[PDB]
Design a protein around this ligand. Structure first.
Ligand SMILES: [Zn+2]
Ligand SMILES: [Zn+2]
Ligand SMILES: [Zn+2]
Lengths: 271, 154, 51, 48, 67, 96, 234, 97, 51, 48
């Protein structure tokens, strides 16, 4: 409840030449080319900076705007403008929905969902769990990852592989999930954080898809007509035949549980 | 009072309720006698609600009775839409009945108001049940023309 | 897989139609006078279950 | 689509529909076949 | 193929046959282009839209002459 | 054109290729083979097991080689219409 | 006449008068991968301009908003909609098949027949909420002591457990349960193991939480599930 | 036919000169009860065609797509097939080369 | 593009039907695009800008 | 660049010289056309 503070006083400048003899900068694709491809998963250099909400979050100029996005750099912890910044420096909360196209972290979501599951999810599929990989020190991997992940958001499921350093924390919301993905990359618990793949478990897929229907039901029940909503519980918490006579006085679901002009309910009152 | 309707899907037979509503049935009877219902499209077909038709224009509007523009509807208590096949009239106001009519496909108890009931389909109900499955575009209108080849009254 | 597996997944080439995500060209039989209706949906259980 | 005049392919399709108990599909297929090739009697004979 | 004389442009590509178009005929009234091919099928074309109107399959072998 | 090919691709499909004095013979061969297939498909009556084009083309090629080498090329079982058509096309090729 | 793009009024701003630009063929549809025109407008002062993300062939096959990717009838993400409602079969996820399906589907949709009617959608929604509410409502003895004593020695028809005071359901439910029993440090759980172990700042808070005792417990993967099968014979 | 072919020809010919056509277009727009809510007031929206950079190369690649299925074939309508007999079947039997 | 100029009093233009009740609120509205009805209007710039 | 030919050096006098020995693949890929070379030489004259 205090103004947000700047993390990095300096600006990290770009000057670096890999493989001193055999690399040359490429002007079109702004990256060094030539030389040994080198392990695809070797460049990963542990991140230097790290952030926590407690000592860093606070007010910023973006809190005023209702549709403002979070700092791409607060989560990774090099937002060097502090409260002057144009993005929120606080943590996503439960009701921080954004549009489907836009990434909840301020970026944009493509459709191909990549191949190495690297940067940003796809709007075509709705997943809240992300692969985190890296160190496999001892059996206390479960507790260390729980400690290092719960402070980024609300958690629904954690599954950690004992044999190898693989964990699959599942978040409740897209906002917290993607914030954690961008906040736990190249950090110390370097972590190889990626997006999760479709479950091959016939049992896990069923419960995930059931979760999808319950999220849909929570979304839609605010839109269905009031009569349908109330009758849903009147049938389950009261007798049924006592009102069919009133219905028989004036009997299908689509005919009766329907809105729009010239419907029976509008016609019944106007008679 | 009895009228056959030679429709594309099949054969439709209607017995008129002359004893209940005489004025609104004589026009239909003599109208089949004149028989300009030839080549008239059932412009409106709604799954489980109605099959409306009877306008020479075919645009869902028009239709001239023997009186010429409209007339008065007569309704009394014992008439109900309790079944699927009651042959009733189409109107657009208090007393605005025209030459066009419709056939009921499901109990419409709410509709026993401003609509005149003057028929029951004794034979050919299967034809109406099939008409309920006709390809229909976005509006309540069949894509192919569901013309009435002939309407012979007997 | 016999003793302890990493669940080795097969390696597709980056240039494939994949021939498994959907029908390669997805052409449906033309609809005729008689309704299929149940003949397929009556046994969607079987569309997956014979498989 | 490649060639609709090949009678063996028509018969093969019909026969594979009889294998899997799809009788309504097969009868629609006969209707299409006989309305496409009215002057070949193999299709008519199989239909009757 | 339909070519504008002046600009050498292929405005229409009347592609409906399955084999070589062995015959041709053009007139001013619709049908404007009539093509008979190896398929034994004669196609009557709508030159304004570049789409076929009527297909004539009475022939058994390739139709080599239109007049 | 260079920038378009850089930012667009070859667009190689759907382009024609003129005959340039090196493809003349190999294209004349295609046209003659297509013409002979057409004539074969025509002179054979209905329901006479049309699967005979390749063998007749082989016969035509052998007739051409025999003419080039001045050999009679007289075949026992060949039907008269096929033999006549082959002679006709061989004479065309020889005059060319 | 290539007049207007289908955009919902939630992301068209709360101003009845907006100004927007169009550049033909300026982008490729993110589903069709077909050329499409962009429409850029300002939702409200103090916000980066929005823009359409998909062609008009899409947002017609999907009944969606070209900008915010929300369906125009239920206002919920299109992915969640097609996953839950399952109204009509979707397209593939690979490039060539999806573009072929989209192009031919756009053709047959322009042929005149609408691929989306809302009657079936409302019916499917009511069915979905109905299904959700309905969803709301000697060999055992040897698999009992096979390793229950063993692990205890290493590092520690009916059976009745014991209660000591020595000093489907997600984990956040556990988190918002133990806040009155003290501050939380970490809660490590597993659905298959059915065991949730919690940590507090002080042992006194944990012990007073344990004192609340008179479904609850007080103090490969299969190795941790041996005692979890006891729930059927607890 | 002249108008149709001329339209197609002009479209073909149009495919180097800098395009100069900028003029606002106003659209009266009517919202329709999307997510319930309370519909919305009628809106008028100003269209302005954003002019393109004369230096822009082609914006994106063009890729080939296999040709779509054709229209269903028409009925054949042949004269009844004739009988050839085994003698004429054999008289067109060609020897191998 | 109505072609016959006609006196006003017959401009009520009734649909003359039993008012199909199966339709929901989405299709009650007439539209070209998926979202709504849009049509041209020749507004001069200054009035649009000031309002 | 944008062609991957980052081993070719276009020095400031507009001479296209490889920075290393090229294999057959690289030599075939790094072959430019008459338009690029003509533009390069016109640029060289302008720079002179
Ligand atoms: Zn910031
Ligand atoms: Zn929107
Ligand atoms: Zn699209």
């Amino acid at each position: 409840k205090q103004p947000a503070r700047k993390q990095i006083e300096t600006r990290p400048e770009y000057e670096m030449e890999p493989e001193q003899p055999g690399q040359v900068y490429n002007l079109w694709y702004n990256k060094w080319s030539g030389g040994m491809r080198q392990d695809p998963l070797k460049s990963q250099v542990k991140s230097e900076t790290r952030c926590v909400i407690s000592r860093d979050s606070g007010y910023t100029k973006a809190d005023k705007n209702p549709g403002s996005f979070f700092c791409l750099y607060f989560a990774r912890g090099m937002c060097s403008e502090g409260s002057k910044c144009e993005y929120l420096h606080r943590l996503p909360k439960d009701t921080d929905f954004f549009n489907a196209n836009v990434d909840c972290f301020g970026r944009e979501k493509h459709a191909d969902y990549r191949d190495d599951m690297g940067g940003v999810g796809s709007f075509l599929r709705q997943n809240y769990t992300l692969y985190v990989g890296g160190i496999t020190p001892t059996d206390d991997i479960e507790e260390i990852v729980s400690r290092h992940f719960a402070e980024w958001g609300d958690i629904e499921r954690i599954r950690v592989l004992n044999s190898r350093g693989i964990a699959f924390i599942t978040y409740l919301n897209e906002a917290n999930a993607q914030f954690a993905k961008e906040a736990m990359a190249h950090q110390s618990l370097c972590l190889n954080v990626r997006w999760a793949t479709t479950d091959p478990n016939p049992a896990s897929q069923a419960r995930n898809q059931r979760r999808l229907e319950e999220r849909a039901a929570n979304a839609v029940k605010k839109l269905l007509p009031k009569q349908f909503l109330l009758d849903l519980e009147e049938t389950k918490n009261g007798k049924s035949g006592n009102r069919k006579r009133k219905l028989e006085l004036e009997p299908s679901d689509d005919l009766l549980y329907a809105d729009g002009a010239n419907s029976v309910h509008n016609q019944l009152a106007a008679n | 009072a009895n009228v056959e309707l030679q429709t594309s899907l099949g054969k439709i037979l209607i017995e008129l309720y002359t004893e209940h509503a005489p004025k609104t049935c004589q026009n239909f009877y003599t109208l089949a006698k004149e028989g300009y219902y030839d080549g008239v499209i059932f412009h409106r077909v709604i799954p489980d609600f109605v099959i409306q038709g009877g306008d020479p224009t075919g645009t869902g509007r028009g239709g001239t009775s023997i009186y010429g523009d409209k007339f008065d509807d007569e309704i009394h208590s014992d008439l109900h839409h309790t079944g699927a096949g009651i042959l009733s009239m189409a109107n657009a106001g208090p007393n605005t009945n025209s030459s066009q009519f419709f056939i009921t496909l499901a109990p419409t108890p709410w509709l026993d108001g401003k609509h005149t009931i003057f028929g029951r389909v004794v034979s050919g109900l299967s034809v109406c049940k099939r008409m309920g499955l006709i390809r229909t575009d976005s509006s309540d209108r069949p894509i192919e023309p569901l013309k009435i080849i002939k309407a012979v009254a007997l | 897989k016999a003793a302890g597996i990493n669940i080795k997944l097969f390696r597709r080439k980056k240039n494939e139609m994949d021939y498994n995500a959907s029908i390669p060209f997805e052409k449906k039989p033309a609809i005729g006078f008689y309704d299929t209706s149940e003949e397929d949906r009556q046994n969607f259980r079987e569309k997956r279950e014979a498989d | 689509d490649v060639d609709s005049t090949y009678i063996p392919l028509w018969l093969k399709y019909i026969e594979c529909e009889m294998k899997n108990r799809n009788i309504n599909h097969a009868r629609n297929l006969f209707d299409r076949a006989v309305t496409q090739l009215p002057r070949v009697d193999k299709l008519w004979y199989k239909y009757v | 193929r339909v070519w504008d004389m002046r600009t050498r442009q292929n405005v229409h590509v009347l592609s409906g046959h399955k084999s070589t178009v062995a015959s041709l005929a053009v007139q001013e009234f619709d049908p404007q282009v009539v093509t008979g091919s190896m398929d034994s099928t004669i196609r009557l074309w709508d030159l304004a839209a570049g789409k076929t109107l009527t297909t004539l399959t009475h022939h058994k072998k390739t139709v080599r002459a239109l007049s | 054109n260079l920038l378009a090919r850089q930012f667009e691709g070859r667009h190689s499909t759907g382009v024609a290729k003129q005959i340039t004095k090196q493809r003349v013979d190999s294209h004349q061969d295609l046209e003659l083979r297509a013409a002979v297939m057409n004539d074969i498909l025509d002179m054979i009556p209905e329901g006479i097991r049309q699967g005979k084009s390749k063998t007749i083309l082989q016969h035509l090629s052998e007739a051409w080689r025999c003419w080039k080498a001045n050999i009679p090329w007289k075949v026992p079982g060949l039907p008269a219409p096929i033999e006549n058509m082959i002679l006709r096309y061989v004479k065309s090729k020889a005059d060319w | 006449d290539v007049e207007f793009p289908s955009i919902c009024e939630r992301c068209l701003g709360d101003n009845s008068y907006v100004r927007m630009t169009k550049e033909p063929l300026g982008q490729e549809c993110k589903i069709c991968s077909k050329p499409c025109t962009i429409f850029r407008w300002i939702k409200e002062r103090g916000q980066k301009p929005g823009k359409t993300q998909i062609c008009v062939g899409c947002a017609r096959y999907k009944n969606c908003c070209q900008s915010c990717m929300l369906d125009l009838q239920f206002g919920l993400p299109i992915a969640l909609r097609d996953a839950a409602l399952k109204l009509v079969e979707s397209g593939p996820t690979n490039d060539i098949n999806r573009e072929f399906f989209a192009q031919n589907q756009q053709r047959l949709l322009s042929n005149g027949e609408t691929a989306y009617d809302s009657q079936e959608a409302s019916a499917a929604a009511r069915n979905l909420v109905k299904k959700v509410e309905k969803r709301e409502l000697v060999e055992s003895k040897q698999i009992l002591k096979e390793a229950r004593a063993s692990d205890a020695s290493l590092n520690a028809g009916n059976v009745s457990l014991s209660i000591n005071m020595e000093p489907e359901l997600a984990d956040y439910k556990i988190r918002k349960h133990f806040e009155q029993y003290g501050p939380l440090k970490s809660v490590v759980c597993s659905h298959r193991a059915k065991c949730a172990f919690v940590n507090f700042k002080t042992r006194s808070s944990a012990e007073i939480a344990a004192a609340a005792s008179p479904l609850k417990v007080q103090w490969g993967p299969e190795g941790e599930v041996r005692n979890a099968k006891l729930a059927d014979l607890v | 036919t002249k108008l149709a072919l001329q339209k197609i020809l002009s479209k073909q010919i149009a495919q180097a000169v800098v395009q100069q056509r900028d003029d606002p277009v106003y659209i009266r727009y009517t919202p329709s009860n999307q997510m319930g809510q309370a519909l919305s007031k009628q809106r008028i929206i100003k269209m302005v065609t954003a002019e393109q950079d004369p230096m822009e190369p082609p914006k994106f690649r063009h890729k080939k797509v296999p040709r779509g299925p054709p229209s269903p074939p028409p009925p054949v309508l042949h004269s009844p097939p004739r009988k050839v007999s085994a003698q004429e079947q054999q008289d067109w039997q060609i020897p191998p080369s | 593009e109505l072609a016959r100029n006609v006196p006003v009093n017959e401009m009520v233009q009734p649909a003359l039907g039993p008012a199909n009740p199966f339709v929901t609120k989405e299709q009650d509205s007439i539209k070209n695009s998926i979202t709504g009805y849009a049509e041209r209007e020749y507004v001069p710039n200054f009035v649009f800008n000031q309002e | 660049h944008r062609k991957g030919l980052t081993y070719l050096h276009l020095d400031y006098n507009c001479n296209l010289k490889p920075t290393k020995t090229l294999t057959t693949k690289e030599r075939k890929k790094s072959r430019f056309g008459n338009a690029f070379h003509l533009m390069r030489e016109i640029l060289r004259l302008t720079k002179l």
